[PDB]
């Protein structure tokens, strides 16, 4: 009923590769092959 702030509590390891017409299309194909092609990644460092 009341959203509680929290840090991420799960971590998943995924990997993939792919060919592509352009570097970005290949990157996209890799994420898709890795299974995370339909979410937006916010790169953390």
């Amino acid at each position: 009923l009341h959203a509680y702030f929290k840090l991420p509590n799960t971590v998943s390891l995924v990997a993939g590769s792919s060919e592509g017409e352009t570097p970005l299309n290949a990157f996209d194909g890799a994420l898709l092959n890795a299974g995370i092609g339909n979410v937006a990644l916010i790169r953390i460092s």
Partner: protein, 112 residues
């Protein structure tokens, strides 16, 4: 960085279009026949109140060499912190370019 008490689980069913905080590494190559690899590692502490360290690596090498490298980088990160290491979870992939390819490895952080 992996939050303390976080759990390594298989990729959950993520909402379409979700904004997922993710640590990743990738390499793109257009050199025909070249083998490129990407790898990710997660160093887990014995002291569960400490966080976990995520390391990524990418390069023109086999997946075997990439995973070996990224696992060592994670080890080094714990030594630098002086933290007791429980274990390291790692994953890697290799790709042999046909015309233009990309190898990608990531650690997706989410909530359950």
């Amino acid at each position: 960085i992996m939050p303390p008490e976080a759990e390594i689980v298989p990729l959950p069913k993520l909402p379409m279009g979700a904004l997922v905080p993710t640590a990743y590494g990738y390499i793109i190559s257009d050199v025909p026949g070249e083998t490129i690899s990407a790898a990710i590692s997660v160093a887990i502490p014995k002291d569960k109140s400490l966080c976990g360290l995520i390391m990524e690596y990418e390069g023109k090498c086999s997946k075997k060499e990439a995973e070996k490298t990224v696992r060592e980088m994670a080890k080094i990160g714990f030594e630098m912190r002086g933290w007791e290491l429980d274990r390291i979870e790692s994953i890697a992939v290799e790709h042999t370019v046909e015309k233009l390819g990309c190898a990608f490895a990531a650690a997706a952080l989410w909530y359950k």
